[PDB]
Amino acid sequence: RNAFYRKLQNFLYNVLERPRGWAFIYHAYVFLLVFSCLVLSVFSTIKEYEKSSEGALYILEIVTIVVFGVEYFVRIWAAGCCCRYRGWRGRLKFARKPFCVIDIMVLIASIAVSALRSLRFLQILRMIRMDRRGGTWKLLGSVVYAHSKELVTAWYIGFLCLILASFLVYLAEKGENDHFDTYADALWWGLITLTTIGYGDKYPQTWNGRLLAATFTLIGVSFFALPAGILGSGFALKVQEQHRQKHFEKRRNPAAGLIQSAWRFYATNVSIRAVCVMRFLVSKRKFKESLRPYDVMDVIEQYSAGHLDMLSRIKSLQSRVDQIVGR
Amino acid sequence: RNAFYRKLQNFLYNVLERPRGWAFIYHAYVFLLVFSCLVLSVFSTIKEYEKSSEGALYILEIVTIVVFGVEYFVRIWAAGCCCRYRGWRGRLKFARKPFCVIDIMVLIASIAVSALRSLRFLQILRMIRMDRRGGTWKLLGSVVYAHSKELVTAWYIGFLCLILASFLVYLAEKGENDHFDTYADALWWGLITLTTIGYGDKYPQTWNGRLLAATFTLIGVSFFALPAGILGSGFALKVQEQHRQKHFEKRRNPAAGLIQSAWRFYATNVSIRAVCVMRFLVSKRKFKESLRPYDVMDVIEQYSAGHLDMLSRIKSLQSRVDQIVGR
Amino acid sequence: RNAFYRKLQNFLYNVLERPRGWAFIYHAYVFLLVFSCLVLSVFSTIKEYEKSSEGALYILEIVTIVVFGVEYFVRIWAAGCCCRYRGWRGRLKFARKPFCVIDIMVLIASIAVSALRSLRFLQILRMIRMDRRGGTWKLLGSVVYAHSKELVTAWYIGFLCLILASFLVYLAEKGENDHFDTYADALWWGLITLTTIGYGDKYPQTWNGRLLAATFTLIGVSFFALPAGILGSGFALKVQEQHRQKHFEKRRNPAAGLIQSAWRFYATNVSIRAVCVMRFLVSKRKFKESLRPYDVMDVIEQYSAGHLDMLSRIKSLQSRVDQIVGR
Amino acid sequence: RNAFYRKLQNFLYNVLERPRGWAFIYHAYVFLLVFSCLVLSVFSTIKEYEKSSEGALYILEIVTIVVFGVEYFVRIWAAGCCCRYRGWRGRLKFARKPFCVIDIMVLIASIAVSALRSLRFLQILRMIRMDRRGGTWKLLGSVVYAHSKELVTAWYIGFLCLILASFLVYLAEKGENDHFDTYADALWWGLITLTTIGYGDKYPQTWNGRLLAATFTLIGVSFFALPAGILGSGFALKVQEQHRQKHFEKRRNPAAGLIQSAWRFYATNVSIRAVCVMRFLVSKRKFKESLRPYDVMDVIEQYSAGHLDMLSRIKSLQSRVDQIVGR
Amino acid sequence: TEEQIAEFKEAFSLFDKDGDGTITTKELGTVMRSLGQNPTEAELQDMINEVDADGNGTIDFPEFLTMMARKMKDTDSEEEIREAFRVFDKDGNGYISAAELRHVMTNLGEKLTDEEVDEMIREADIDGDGQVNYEEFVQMMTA
Amino acid sequence: TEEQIAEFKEAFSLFDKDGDGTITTKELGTVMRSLGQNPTEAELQDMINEVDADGNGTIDFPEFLTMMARKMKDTDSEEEIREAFRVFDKDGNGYISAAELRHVMTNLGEKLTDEEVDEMIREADIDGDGQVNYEEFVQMMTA
Amino acid sequence: TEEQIAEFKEAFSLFDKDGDGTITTKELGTVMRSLGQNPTEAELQDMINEVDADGNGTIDFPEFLTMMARKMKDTDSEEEIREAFRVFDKDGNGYISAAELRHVMTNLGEKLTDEEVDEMIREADIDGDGQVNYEEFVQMMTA
Amino acid sequence: TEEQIAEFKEAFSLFDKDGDGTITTKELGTVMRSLGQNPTEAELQDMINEVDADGNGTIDFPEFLTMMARKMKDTDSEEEIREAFRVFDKDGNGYISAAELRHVMTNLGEKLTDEEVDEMIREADIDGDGQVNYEEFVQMMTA
Ligand SMILES: Nc1cc2c3c(cccc3c1NC(=O)c1ccc(F)cc1)CC2
Ligand SMILES: Nc1cc2c3c(cccc3c1NC(=O)c1ccc(F)cc1)CC2
Ligand SMILES: Nc1cc2c3c(cccc3c1NC(=O)c1ccc(F)cc1)CC2
Ligand SMILES: Nc1cc2c3c(cccc3c1NC(=O)c1ccc(F)cc1)CC2
């Protein structure tokens, strides 16, 4: 029953590795399971709830270790679906994946288990391992890079405003207020107020201080809130762009051309061969040039191609009418 | 006077059920009326204002019950406009609607009236019933789903930043600060500061704590503010899209084709019948394919159709000029 | 020198009334002048700075009254530029403008001057009068109306979250925390925390309270921040739309047609008259149909017109080639 | 080896002046270096850490002065690449640049070094000099100017809401609350609450105060958060526009025409000359009209040109078919 | 049944002029022209894709027979026509006047002769109120 | 009046060549060509929709008479022409020079002969200041 | 080698009809037509830019020889074809059926005769599982 | 001067074939065709708007004389050509090689004969470094 064996291996690889549908339910389940361990550890930190929290946490962590071990074994087994990871050589190369070795370290350390500090560190490490593909980090980095200049503008001007406001309020409040006795305390106040956190541990009391704080909050608060707004709008616009580009989806014909071209090139193994290789180059360029823009540039280019085509047809018709005139 | 009876029934159904214009005035009136009951209950909770608040609340709640009863009865009566709910059978099926039964439960419990806790719970339940169509929930869910990946990125990285910053500040302030005596207190501080709530009950005091808090606020505050910005931009972009799509509105001809096709299909009750059913299929596909994109994809498709059609015409003219050449 | 008189009257009307360039400098000057009076009044409220603040405020307010009087007189005089306001009748009708009578009331009350309370009220009234055109209110109302459904969704769900979180935390903290002794105090805490104001006067202390506060802040804070983000994105998108629409500016030819049509209609004062009036109707419809869309709908309509026209030309060429075939 | 000399001079000018790639690494290095001096100064302000902070800061500042001096000298030397700054005259004119003279003042004052106050002022001055091109300020000013009307609407209405809410809460809390004893204190509270800073030093306590504070926070918080959202969305939209416009890049042919036109004009030194100068004018107009729109206006104009062209061709074909009819 | 199979085979033979049990676009177009209607390339390809469940561009006899086997109720178009008429239900009350119905049927979408609309009103004016219902209409259509 | 009704009927008869009291697009186009101007399909359909208050594409005599009955003031176009001129009031002061007025009237929108603009200035140069007003202008035309 | 150089020169001479060691677009088009294929202006210019590393629009013999010198592995197209087939790997499991493979080969992009696809399956059905792999496929292709 | 005025009048007479002191689009096009170049409607109208400071579409002799009076420096095009060449200054260093300069001049924008580029390099290769500067270039042209 090797057919059903392979089918099940494929299904398990689909679930454990990139899921699309209700395998997200399993992934969220294992998440919630580790998150529950984290929360129970947090409660175990408290002395009053130490006993019950520890009692539940022992079993919850043992279940976590069992599930992580079984999942890791099933993952390494189901990696066989991809031909890259076949046999012992291929599967060991699969274990070379950074997240696989990280997961192995997780299991080893957990079975081995500053004990509480180490437990907290390893909980954080499990959580970061949760991603396992880098999608979130890649997306965030992409959007940040896209808006690098605006983010840097916000950072620079907001930092300047923070420094200036903190120094001015320090000058106005150095003596009359216990809070701003050193420039560092004034900087702490400025950072905590421009972020709108406002702990209230420090705040100006002299009229100079309150006036300057008002006129500099009315600037710094907006500057510190900017990056969040910039990134949010960038994310929303990117979502809209992905939604639009999902429609036209013009990656098909270039791919067919490229694959048929490679097949012919292998079949080609002097002028006919020159034509074969040149058309293979043409197919490759079509593939990449379809890959590159993937946006309204294609639409504008299609408009231009249609326009020039119709002008050429116009010239042909003019030539025909002229020839009829001559005839 | 059954004609005026039906006209008034239709008007009342339009008002009570989906309104468009100044029936929103009545809906806002009944809202304000229940909201006033809620506020008066809140004031009744206070001992000092217990007497006057209770005195007003008795009459306000009795008026609420009267208006809700009359509105429910008028709604069940006016549901007759829709043929689906006709006669006792149809109107009883209408009462099967979840919000109708919820409203009945509201009336029964109110007339029946942990008394204060129950009153608060039922006020909340009335408020949730206020929607009665799920429009707000559906819209919010749609926009959240559209940006699911970005929201998950923000959630994941912001949660990681919260955990890391809380642990680092706890380490830096475990002994020297009374606030961070347990990891749970440090996590409370981290959550309250990254949200920019900043109660001020906890805040770092050691230089390690303040430094780490600064460098991790300058990240966590933006991450926690992101989801709001992402959703706001998504909502605004969706509004702009609805405004644009409101113009072209190309659902007319496909619908006319579909209804005429169904009429013919009924009239059709061998090759003529095959043509009739096949063209009915054509009409159905036209209807759905008009339904699906409802966006700029329609414009691009129209561009493609125009381009290919004009190219075909060009070929026709080329053939004609060639034939003239031959002649 | 009536020509220079009229030229100067026009220039002053342009400055005082709708300005475009460096008349904004004068408007900002008079603003700053009234704002300085407001700030000096604020300082006069303080006992310690009462003397100096009052001393400066006397002269600053007298200067304010002088400038407001001269500006009002110059405005009523320069309203003569518009032929609507000519002679005593026209200028009196101009004085009928709500902001003109508001300015008259301001001047009368100021010369007449709960004295401090009245002064504060009149300062607020001057500030609101500052607009004098309703532009800010109209713009804000327009953008709010555009996103009415999204704003209502945010309001509704955020209010529900506030009520639910406040009640749950009240239940969890009714006894163990001095802050939440009445439901009203819990609601105050919920409103102050979900807005991210976080006064810190109230905050949960029991583990139930802190847990529920965390899970409900992670929702309410975003919901309360939504409206700001929605409106900000709406404003930015509207700005982008205005920038785009500023280019094509297709209001010229319809207006020329309409004015020439009205001139002809006056000149027309039976079949010729029928054509004249009917073409006047055509011109009016062209004017309005140019007014209405003012967006990409025009562009799509132009595309459609070009398409259908070229298809008609194609039909003409097909007919010609067919006739040649016959010949 | 003047060739390698010039090559190295060009590379150094590229690095020090406008960089594109990994020269940003050097710029970030010198930034971090000055930022470290700032932080060490902040720590030197504290008495407890005065000794170690001063000890490190001496050497760090000396290194800063050395690096700034060498960088300034290398910059003045490498400015020779641009022909504008050649020889002593050109390089001295280069030193006329505002940032070059600012940098010279920086070195002079540092070597010369209210000593601590002067040091803080000069640290701020170095930081502002960091930009050296005004890019951040220009970008921020551009985006603010684009949304000037929306920002002014937010400012105006939010300021009115602040004034009104502060006065109302002052009235409601003048006697019963120690915080609001003067209108200035109430205004301080209003500014600190509508910004969502919420120090908690002042907050309403009477039921009037809490009610009014609730209903006015639910407005002022959004108004004060608006400008951040507006600017963030503006920045994101501008980024999207730059990304789109980066594609077509149509500035090539107009520039080629303009330069060839100028060459011909110089060569031209009567009807032939008239043609030369008129075509030079044509080239100049093409260049500028290409510079101006740089947006979708180009696409719409191209559509219009293609349309009118094809209609003219249609007329030509109609004339030809008519002539054939006659023949 | 046997008569249905024989008549379907005769209709197919009139359709697939090639005689190889494969109705192509050209033969469908020719039979359509014989019937009078003029099908375009888009119409023909949409038609074939609608009937072609294999993807070869031609239909075999069992495919045609099974597509014909679908009845009014088996089509499950009740919801589709319901929403379509709702789109045509301008007021949304659940009814539409005779004049508006005639206008939309004759002059929008596919133009169709007045005899067909007269027949539809004849077989649909159960109550003859002018504002004739469409919900029970489509219910009896599917039945 | 009776004379107005008779002249309107004569004009309609010259319009509706069919003689069935239904002015169609073709007859309107032919009469317009006889008048000299060339109306396009878009112009013809916009016109017919402007006059056709029923939707059948043809106009009966009472409809033509009632649309003709509208006077200058009854049209309530004062606001429309006022705002149009404001659009043409470049400065916005309430006046426009003779040269700019002539240019905009002759060379923008619909091209019209110089005699018409000469007549308009003759009947409108109440003050003859060059920068002739348009507000009182439109008031007097509407009256 | 010497034989390779001579055969390349003969092919070029058949290409550059001008005989000046500069293959132009017109000569490429003529030889393409002789071969049967019809190259368009876009195809011709894309090809010339692909081969023209100088920018003069014509190719000299050493350029032709050096572009021909590239082998299957030297092209470094393994990644390109890998991702292309992945795009054609609908499921993403790493395999594709014979029917879908033939459909994409002969009915999408550039239509290719059935003989070529038959030959590819003949030389590629190492296991003959229908769901034939493409990774080892392309590995052997590049080798 | 007097000779300049007379020669300008002769050139205008060759331009305005009408003889009424009003150079129209048709006459400009005819003289352009005589010169060899073919001006399009867009080019003709752009030119006329460039010269027509009144807006009547035709130019009188004083207008032609005053536009011709402009010299190289009076044009104030130094900044325009400076920025244009900067656009053509790919590296931005302030210099451009001879090969790239020739390519951009001959093959982009307006195609111009090789004699003109040879003459420009002859009159511009002050240093003959290949990477010839453009700043002093434009300074010397403007002078
Ligand atoms: N919000 C915000 C404000 C300011 C910052 C300053 C310096 C550095 C970072 C930030 C800073 N942090 C981000 O913008 C951010 C967001 C998301 C992310 F992933 C990384 C950084 C001065 C003012
Ligand atoms: N804002 C915000 C930040 C963070 C969150 C984290 C985990 C879960 C939710 C949120 C979280 N909540 C929403 O984003 C949200 C908004 C609207 C809505 F309807 C539901 C959830 C970590 C950081
Ligand atoms: N922000 C914000 C949140 C919430 C609100 C709720 C009820 C009413 C208003 C708001 C409310 N206020 C606005 O959205 C707003 C903004 C601008 C403006 F002009 C008017 C209202 C529940 C949660
Ligand atoms: N946020 C914010 C709110 C309010 C303001 C008021 C008056 C003046 C400025 C602001 C004000 N400041 C900015 O909007 C801003 C942002 C960025 C920048 F560069 C300059 C100003 C009333 C309410």
Curated annotation (Swiss-Prot), chains A, B, C, D:
Motif stretch (Selectivity filter): 196-201
Effect of G198S: More than 50% reduction of wt heteromeric current. Ratio of 1:1 and 1:1:2
Spans annotated as Mediates interaction with SLC5A3/SMIT1: 141-242
Residues on Extracellular side: 45-54, 173-182, 196-206
Documented effect of changing R126W: In BFNS1; phenotype manifestations include myokymia in some patients; leads to a shift of voltage-dependent activation of the channel and a dramatic slowing of activation upon depolarization
Effect seen on changing T136A: In BFNS1; also in patients with infantile seizures; no effect on channel current or expression
Transmembrane regions listed in the UniProt entry: 22-44, 55-76, 95-113, 116-134, 147-172, 207-233
Binding site for a 1,2-diacyl-sn-glycero-3-phospho-(1D-myo-inositol-4,5-bisphosphate): R133, K149, K246
Effect of A225T: In BFNS1 and DEE7; 20%-40% reduction of wt current in heteromeric channels
PTM text: KCNQ2/KCNQ3 are ubiquitinated by NEDD4L. Ubiquitination leads to protein degradation. Degradation induced by NEDD4L is inhibited by USP36.
Phenotypic consequence of A115V: In BFNS1; with infantile seizures
Domain remark in the UniProt entry: Each subunit contains six transmembrane segments (S1-S6) with S1-S4 forming one voltage sensing domain (VSD) and S5-S6 contributing to form one quarter of an interlocking pore-forming domain (PD). The S4-S5 linker preferentially interacts with PIP2 in the open-state KCNQ2 channel, whereas the S2-S3 loop interacts with PIP2 in the closed state.
Family in the record: Belongs to the potassium channel family. KQT (TC 1.A.1.15) subfamily. Kv7.2/KCNQ2 sub-subfamily.
Subunit structure and binding partners: Heterotetramer with KCNQ3; forms heterotetrameric M-channel responsible for the native M-current. Homotetrameric; forms a functional homotetrameric channel resulting in the expression of a small M-current. Interacts with calmodulin; the interaction is calcium-independent, constitutive and participates in the proper assembly of a functional M-channel. May associate with KCNE2. Interacts with IQCJ-SCHIP1. Interacts (via the pore module) with SLC5A3/SMIT1; forms a coregulatory complex that alters ion selectivity, voltage dependence and gating kinetics of the channel.
Protein name, entry field: Potassium voltage-gated channel subfamily KQT member 2
Residues of the full protein shown: 70 to 595 of 872
Curated annotation (Swiss-Prot), chains E, F, G, H:
Phosphoserine sites (modified residues): S77, S97
Phosphothreonine carried by residues: T40, T106
Modified residues (N6-methyllysine): K111
Major subcellular location class: cytoplasm
Residue sites binding Ca(2+) 3 per the record: D89, D91, N93, Y95, E100
Record-level GO cellular component terms: calcium channel complex; calyx of Held; catalytic complex; centrosome; cytoplasm; cytosol; extracellular region; myelin sheath
UniProt key word Zinc: no
Localization, UniProt: Cytoplasm, Cytoskeleton, Spindle; Cytoplasm, Cytoskeleton, Spindle pole; Cytoplasm, Cytoskeleton, Microtubule organizing center, Centrosome; Cell projection, Cilium, Flagellum
Region Necessary and sufficient for interaction with PCP4, annotated ranges: 72-143
Residues holding Ca(2+) 1: D16, D18, D20, T22, E27
Chain sites annotated for binding Ca(2+) 4: D125, D127, D129, Q131, E136
Post-translational modifications reported in the UniProt record: Ubiquitination results in a strongly decreased activity.
Alphabetized InterPro entries for the sequence: CALM/Myosin/TropC-like, EF-hand-dom_pair, EF_Hand_1_Ca_BS, EF_hand_dom
Modified residues (N6,N6,N6-trimethyllysine): K111
A GO biological-process term: substantia nigra development
SMART domains linked to this entry: EFh
Disease involvement: Ventricular tachycardia, catecholaminergic polymorphic, 4: An arrhythmogenic disorder characterized by stress-induced, bidirectional ventricular tachycardia that may degenerate into cardiac arrest and cause sudden death. Patients present with recurrent syncope, seizures, or sudden death after physical activity or emotional stress. CPVT4 inheritance is autosomal dominant.
Domains as described in the record: The N-terminal and C-terminal lobes of CALM bind to the C-terminus of KCNQ1 in a clamp-like conformation. Binding of CALM C-terminus to KCNQ1 is calcium-independent but is essential for assembly of the structure. Binding of CALM N-terminus to KCNQ1 is calcium-dependent and regulates electrophysiological activity of the channel. The C-lobe interacts with KCNN4 channels in a calcium-independent manner, whereas the N-lobe interacts with the S4-S5 linker of KCNN4 in a calcium-dependent manner playing a role as calcium sensor and gating the channel.
Record family assignment: Belongs to the calmodulin family.
Assembly and binders: Homotetramer. Interacts with MYO1C, MYO5A and RRAD. Interacts with MYO10. Interacts with CEP97, CCP110, TTN/titin and SRY. Interacts with USP6; the interaction is calcium dependent. Interacts with CDK5RAP2. Interacts with SCN5A. Interacts with RYR1. Interacts with FCHO1. Interacts with MIP in a 1:2 stoichiometry; the interaction with the cytoplasmic domains from two MIP subunits promotes MIP water channel closure. Interacts with ORAI1; this may play a role in the regulation of ORAI1-mediated calcium transport. Interacts with IQCF1. Interacts with SYT7.
Miscellaneous field: This protein has four functional calcium-binding sites.
Protein name: Calmodulin-1
Lineage, opening ranks: Eukaryota, Metazoa, Chordata, Craniata, Vertebrata
Annotated gene: CALM1
